[PDB]
C-alpha cells in the first residue's frame, strides 16, 4: 500500500470554458486545470483501483489500502476548507466529484474498516455531504448535471453510514433530475450545450442511474419514480451515439464525434433495468467502463453488485 498523498483542506481549481454556453475549450486553461486538480483526480483513481482489486476477491489488502487512503484524507480534513471561485466553480465541481469517488470507495470497502477508521471516514464524508449540499443553497447556482452528480457522494455516504436523513437528501436530488426530464426526453440545461449536448445528456444520466442502483441496496425502488422519464432520457442518449440527428436538431449544433467512455458506463447498470435493453447494445460494446467518480469498474460492478460479498 503506497503512502497516501497530501489531502489539502482547500481546492484552488480554475475553469477553462470560454463561452456563455460552456461548450468552447481554452486548451491552455484546460491543461492548467488538469494540473491543479491532479492530487484530487489521482486520489480518486487510486481508491477506485483499490476497491476494484478488493472486489476481485483474495485481495483483502487492496480493500485495507483504500481505507488507509480514505482515513488519511479524513484526518487531514481534505476538501473541507476554502473553495476558490475563479473563472467558474470548477473547485466546487471537483469537491462534488471527489466526494463521490471517496464515498463510493468507502461504501465498497467498509467491511474491512476498523472502528476508528469508521468514525474518521464517516464523519468526514458527512461533513463533505453538508458542505457540498450547502453550495446549492444559492439559487443562482443553476441545478444542471453538477447538482445530480452532487447526489452521488451524498447517497453513497447515506448508504454506508445508514443515515436515513442523508438518504432522503439524495432522493430529493435524484427526483429533481427525473423531474427536469421533458416529455420528449430533453434536459433543457444540457441541450443548451450545443455541440456537447449529447455528451452532457450522457453525463447527466450517469449519476441518476447510479443513485437509483444504490437505492436498491436500501430496499427502495427509485427507478419507479415518474417511471418512463428516465428511460426516455437514457434512450435518447443511446440513440444519439447511433444517430446524432435529434441532438443536432434540438441543440442547433453538430455534435462532436465521440464514443461512449468512462461515465457512459451507467449503461452497464441500466441495460439490466430498461424495458428495451437492446437499444444499449452498441454503448455496452464500447466497454469495459471505468470511472473513479462512480466507484471504479462499472462493467464489473453491474454484474458483481456494487458492494462485494465480504469474506
Burial bucket for residue 138 (CB in 10 Å: 0-12, 13-18, 19+) = exposed
- Partnered with residue 88 across adjacent β-strands are 86
- Matching residue, cell 488507509: 68
Q: How many other CB atoms are there within 10 angstroms of residue 111's CB atom?
A: 14
What CA–CA distance (Å, rounded) separates 298 from 55? 12
What CA–CA distance (Å, rounded) separates 164 from 274? 27
Full domain range(s) for residue 176: 27-304
Is 8 among the domain residues?
no
What CA–CA distance (Å, rounded) separates 224 from 217? 15
- Matching residue, cell 448508504: 159
- Give the count of alpha carbons within 13 A of 20, CB side only: 1
Is 12 among the domain residues?
no
Is 95 among the domain residues?
yes
Nearest to 87, CA basis, from 173, 156, 166, 18: 18
Is 5 among the domain residues?
no
Is 266 among the domain residues?
yes
Contact 190, 253 (CB under 8 A): no
- Partnered with residue 291 across adjacent β-strands are 296
Resolution (A): 1.9
Q: How many other CB atoms are there within 10 angstroms of residue 188's CB atom?
A: 11
Q: What is the DSSP track for 96-157?
A: HHHHHHHHHHHHHHGGG--HHHHHHHHHHHHHHHHHHHHHTTSTTS--SHHHHHHHHHHHHH
Cβ burial 210-229 (10 Å sphere, 16+ → b, else e)? bbbbbbbeeeeebbebeeeb
C-alpha cell at 155: 447517497
Torsion-angle region of residue 271: left (phi > 0), alpha (psi -120 to 50) or beta? alpha
What CA–CA distance (Å, rounded) separates 174 from 154? 11
- Experimental technique for the deposited model: X-ray
What CA–CA distance (Å, rounded) separates 124 from 118? 10
What CA–CA distance (Å, rounded) separates 295 from 306? 8
Radius of gyration of the chain (CA): 18
Q: How many other CB atoms are there within 10 angstroms of residue 72's CB atom?
A: 18
Q: Structurally, how many domains does the chain consist of?
A: 1
DSSP at 264: G
Is 39 among the domain residues?
yes
Is 216 among the domain residues?
yes
- The CA angle 204-210-215, to the nearest 5 degrees, is 130
Is 1 among the domain residues?
no
Amino acid at each position: 500500500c503506497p503512502a497516501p498523498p497530501p489531502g489539502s483542506p482547500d481546492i484552488r481549481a480554475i475553469g477553462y470554458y470560454t463561452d456563455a454556453a460552456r461548450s468552447v475549450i481554452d486548451p491552455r486553461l484546460k491543461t492548467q486545470n488538469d494540473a491543479a486538480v491532479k492530487p484530487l483526480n489521482a486520489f480518486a483513481a487510486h481508491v477506485a483501483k483499490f476497491a476494484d482489486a478488493y472486489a476481485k476477491g483474495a485481495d483483502e489488502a487492496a480493500g485495507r489500502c483504500a481505507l488507509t487512503w480514505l482515513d488519511a484524507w479524513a484526518r487531514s480534513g481534505a476538501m473541507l476548507g476554502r473553495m476558490a471561485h475563479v473563472n467558474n466553480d470548477q473547485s466546487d465541481y471537483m469537491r462534488q466529484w471527489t466526494h463521490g469517488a471517496a464515498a463510493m470507495a468507502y461504501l465498497r470497502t467498509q467491511a474491512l474498516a476498523s472502528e476508528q477508521q469508521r468514525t474518521d471516514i464517516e464523519t468526514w464524508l458527512k461533513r463533505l455531504s453538508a458542505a457540498n449540499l450547502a453550495y446549492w443553497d444559492n439559487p443562482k447556482h443553476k441545478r444542471n448535471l453538477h447538482y445530480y452528480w452532487t447526489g452521488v457522494g451524498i447517497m453513497a455516504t447515506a448508504v454506508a453510514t445508514r443515515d436515513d436523513t442523508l438518504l432522503n437528501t439524495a432522493q430529493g436530488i435524484y427526483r429533481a433530475g427525473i423531474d427536469a426530464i421533458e416529455p420528449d426526453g430533453r434536459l433543457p440545461m444540457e441541450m443548451a450545450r450545443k455541440r456537447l449536448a449529447l455528451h452532457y445528456h450522457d453525463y447527466a444520466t450517469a449519476p441518476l442511474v447510479l443513485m437509483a442502483e444504490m437505492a436498491r441496496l436500501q430496499g427502495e425502488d427509485w427507478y419507479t419514480y415518474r417511471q418512463g422519464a428516465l428511460e426516455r432520457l437514457a434512450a435518447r442518449v443511446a440513440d444519439g451515439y447511433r444517430d446524432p440527428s435529434w441532438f443536432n436538431t434540438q441543440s442547433g449544433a453538430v455534435q462532436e464525434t465521440a464514443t461512449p467512455k468512462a461515465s457512459s458506463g451507467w449503461v452497464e447498470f441500466y441495460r439490466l433495468r430498461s424495458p428495451d435493453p437492446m437499444r444499449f447494445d452498441a454503448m455496452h460494446a464500447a466497454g469495459p467502463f471505468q470511472d473513479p467518480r462512480m466507484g471504479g469498474n462499472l462493467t464489473l460492478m453491474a454484474q458483481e453488485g456494487i458492494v462485494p460479498l465480504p469474506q
